[PDB]
Design a protein around this nucleic acid. Structure first.
Lengths: 61, 61, 507, 232
DNA sequence: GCTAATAAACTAAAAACTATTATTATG
DNA sequence: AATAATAGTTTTTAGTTTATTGGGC
């Protein structure tokens, strides 16, 4: 989120570490009170003007 | 619409974030209205639900 | 379809099964009956459409229509019902055990031919097609009918007989001081293709854990989602099967049922002329959409011809390198296509050839896809997925083509993103160290839906009238204290490395 | 609502064919209720259940005015669904059971209504007129033939066109197999010929179609055809 | 101070995959 | 006087409804 440039630098370091290590982050997402929390995969997306992580939902057994 | 929240890491780190459903499915933003064939209005067009008695009857439940 | 499943459960109604090596341990009767509860619960969760039965032997009574002594049927092959579960629970535990032993005999001589007879008859009664003539029993002795050579002979004769009729049987090891004496009397009478001749297994040694464990999946059968055709060149057209190896779950439909009867009410909902209180007609329906001044009126077949673009099918658009797709161009969950020869025979040869070639080519198959009638076509890519095996040569990945979906231009929603920000390599090293601290080898099936699981707990506890709904454990909760101890001070080290120590990440 | 229900419908149908004005009066209530259950726009019922139209095809009573006041509504619904049916744009010019059901319904109900007074007459003529290919003894063409034959008069003043095509289609249909289809075509033939003779007799243009249409084919008739030609 | 996305739950909706059978042929 | 083409069985699946933060002054 904007106005937290320290969080921006932290996110950038996260992205760089993911690139170097070829890691992908397993995460738990809960949209709101009445949306079911669920599991997805987060991987970085990098463009010259922005680096970002991309969340994709994942299934259960 | 973005998702301004705070990603929690372990037990001591939190990062304000802004998610975006950048890729999305395609669906019409204008629904279809079934108006009357004569008045061309839906005001006379409304549903009547009947939970007809599941026994040897037809009274709405 | 290819058949259904059939299985019966047999229990030695004898005092040797109501005892234990140390009575603090469960009696074989008690462990067996609770395992049956577990199995039936698993069936109700998963495949209650199958038919399940229970019969006794050794009890000093018999209920079989055969009327052979000590052969007391409990239940016929029936779909697992809560009533059956309660019938089991009234005698489960080592007090209902005593109540059973009171109202029901326990411990007497008999021949195995009798129980084999009655179970064969029970299988013969059901008219449906069963793909598995499975037989289950619970005992840890092989001597009492090997004690009499005539009993042993007839038992093994009938065992070979039922094997001839394709009947399958299995026994779990039960807790005995002596044991069922592996291969003393059960190495040919039992239809086995494996070997465990390492211990008479006086102790229990079996898959009972999985039998007593409860899976929460439906595991529906294998169905061809579609046999839709590829329009290669509009002349050569191929038949292929459509499948997914994963399906987003759901909840059972809410059966609306009447209050003082619990009876689901047949319900009819319809529109009507609200202006006069009259009843409308399907012709009365006029589809409409208002834009500014004019409201525009259309019909149903009009509403589908605008949706009509081309026949249901696959239209090959060309070849594209696999690398030319970035994973952030993701869409609805990917599908898979398998070759088939139901109409287009020889097409599987083509499928194999193209699979191998584009695997060497390292390119995807770009196609134009119409699922169904009056459906627009869409851009789709076919990555060649290779048949992947294991030590057991099991298709951990089957052959064919994984179906992925190409988002369109409108699908993109470019955010008002800000600039790009870098970070120092020391922070990157901090992150690498932290990742290795909290490294976790991925495993797909290590997770379920806590909402799904808890709603189950509610459902089966409700039907079972439990002292509480089961406390479903959420695997998706990260063990926060475990990561704290697994990281140490690296958290705050990197925090002060990046975050201004005065400035908390909290506003 | 299945073979049980269908057999029940068949039973009460044959009852009304037998029973005539002894207790044929506790039907108007039932007539309204079948209109309502037909007004259940849910697509749950099977096409076989659409034999319900023969149910509403009614001739066992005087049909009090309310029957008429709903009959036109029924008719319009059937016309709309037919407009849906023939449009091969849905890939379907198909209506497997529907055709005979609505045929019988309009057979029993046109007895009370719909003389030549308006365009709707010509409209229903046309929807019948579209009668391509069928299967399994080709019941739908026979249904159309009976339907037209019973109410040929209610089709006058709009049969004066396409007579060449109508005529030859009739000839081939009776020439075709499925002797039920043959006799249906025969009946439709005689009804058509009588009606056109009646209109021609009262014309002033009778000479045109007379000398331009008839003696040539009548000569050209020279199996069963001749006999019909004899009447012709 | 006003009332816009929104995923969730809820409908209908079409195909798979049934098992069944009116057919013509033929005596 | 026989064989044949043809039914909903579920099962996904794709519009609907709602009760949800949001821009306003």
């Amino acid at each position: 989120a904007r106005d937290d440039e320290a969080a921006a630098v932290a996110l950038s370091s996260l992205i760089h570490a993911l690139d170097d290590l070829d890691m992908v982050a397993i995460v738990r997402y809960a949209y709101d009170k009445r949306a079911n929390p669920q599991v997805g995969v987060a991987f970085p997306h990098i463009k010259h003007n922005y680096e970002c992580l991309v969340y994709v939902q994942l299934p259960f057994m | 619409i973005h998702w301004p929240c705070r990603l929690t890491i372990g037990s001591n780190l939190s990062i304000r974030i802004a998610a975006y459903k950048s890729i999305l499915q395609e669906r019409v933003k204008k629904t279809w209205t079934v108006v009357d064939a004569k008045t061309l209005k839906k005001e006379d067009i409304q549903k009547e639900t009947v939970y007809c008695l599941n026994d040897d009857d037809e009274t709405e439940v | 379809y290819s058949g259904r499943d059939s299985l019966i459960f047999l229990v030695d109604a004898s005092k040797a099964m109501f005892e234990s090596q140390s009575e603090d341990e469960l009696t074989p009767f008690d462990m067996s009956i609770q395992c049956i509860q577990s199995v039936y619960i698993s069936k109700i969760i998963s495949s209650d459409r199958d038919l399940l039965a229970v019969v006794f032997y050794g009890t000093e009574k018999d209920k079989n229509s055969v009327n052979f002594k000590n052969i007391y049927v409990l239940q016929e092959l029936d779909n697992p019902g809560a009533k059956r579960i309660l019938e089991l629970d009234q005698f489960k535990g080592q007090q209902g055990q005593k109540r059973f032993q009171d109202m029901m005999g326990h411990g007497s001589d008999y021949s195995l031919s009798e129980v084999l007879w009655v179970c064969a008859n029970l299988f013969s009664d059901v008219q449906f097609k069963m793909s598995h003539k499975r037989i289950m029993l619970f005992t840890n002795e092989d001597n009492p009918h090997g004690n009499d050579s005539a009993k042993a002979s007839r038992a093994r004769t009938k065992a070979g007989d039922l094997r001839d009729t394709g009947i399958f049987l299995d026994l779990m090891h039960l807790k005995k001081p002596g044991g069922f004496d592996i291969s003393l009397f059960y190495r040919d009478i039992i239809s086995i293709a494996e070997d465990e001749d390492l211990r008479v297994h006086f102790e229990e040694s079996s898959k009972l854990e999985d039998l007593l464990r409860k899976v929460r999946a439906k595991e529906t059968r294998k169905r061809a989602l579609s046999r839709l055709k590829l329009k290669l060149n509009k002349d050569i057209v191929i038949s292929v099967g459509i499948y997914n190896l994963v399906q987003k779950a759901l909840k059972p439909p809410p059966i609306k049922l009447y209050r003082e009867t619990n009876e689901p009410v047949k319900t009819k909902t319809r529109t009507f002329n609200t202006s006069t209180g009259g009843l409308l007609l399907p012709s009365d329906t006029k589809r409409s959409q208002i834009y500014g001044s004019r409201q525009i009126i259309l019909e149903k077949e009009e509403t589908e011809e605008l949706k009509r673009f081309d026949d249901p099918g696959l239209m090959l658009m060309g070849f594209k390198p696999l690398v030319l797709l970035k994973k952030h161009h993701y869409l609805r969950p990917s599908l898979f296509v398998y070759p088939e020869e139901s109409l287009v025979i020889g097409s599987s040869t083509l499928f194999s050839a193209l699979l191998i070639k584009c695997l060497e080519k390292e390119v995807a198959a770009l196609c134009r896809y119409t699922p169904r009638r009056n459906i627009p076509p869409y851009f789709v890519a076919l990555v060649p997925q290779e048949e992947e095996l294991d030590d057991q040569k099991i298709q951990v990945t089957p052959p064919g083509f994984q179906l992925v979906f190409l988002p369109f231009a409108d699908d993109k929603r470019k955010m008002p993103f800000t600039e790009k920000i870098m970070a120092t390599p020391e922070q990157v090293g901090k992150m690498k160290a932290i990742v290795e601290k909290l490294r976790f080898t991925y495993r797909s099936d290590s997770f379920e839906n806590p909402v799904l699981q808890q709603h189950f707990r509610n459902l089966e506890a409700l039907a079972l009238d439990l002292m509480e709904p089961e406390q479903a454990v959420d695997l998706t909760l990260p063990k926060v204290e475990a990561m704290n101890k697994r990281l140490g001070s690296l958290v705050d080290e990197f925090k002060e490395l990046v975050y201004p120590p005065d400035y908390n990440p909290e506003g | 609502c299945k073979i049980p229900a269908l057999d029940l419908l068949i039973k009460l149908l044959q009852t009304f064919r037998s029973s005539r004005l002894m207790d044929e009066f506790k039907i108007g209530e039932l007539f309204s209720k079948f209109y309502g259950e037909l007004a259940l726009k849910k697509k749950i019922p099977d096409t076989v259940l659409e034999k319900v139209y023969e149910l509403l095809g009614l001739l066992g009573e005087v049909h009090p005015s309310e029957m008429i006041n709903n009959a036109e509504n029924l008719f319009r619904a059937f016309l709309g669904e037919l407009k849906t049916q023939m449009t091969s744009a849905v890939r379907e010019p198909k209506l497997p059971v529907l055709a005979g059901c609505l045929k019988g319904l309009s057979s029993l109900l046109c007895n009370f209504t719909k003389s030549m007074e308006e365009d709707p007459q010509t409209s229903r003529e046309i929807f019948n007129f579209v009668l391509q290919i069928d299967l399994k003894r080709y019941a739908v063409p026979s249904a159309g033939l009976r339907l037209f034959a019973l109410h040929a008069s209610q089709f006058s003043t709009c049969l004066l066109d396409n007579y060449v095509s109508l005529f030859e289609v009739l000839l081939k249909w009776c020439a075709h197999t499925n002797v039920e289809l043959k006799k249906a075509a025969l009946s439709a033939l005689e009804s058509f010929l009588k009606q056109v003779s009646n209109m021609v007799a009262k014309n002033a243009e009778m000479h045109k179609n007379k000398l331009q249409y008839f003696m040539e084919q009548f000569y050209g008739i020279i199996n069963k055809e001749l006999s019909i030609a004899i009447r012709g």
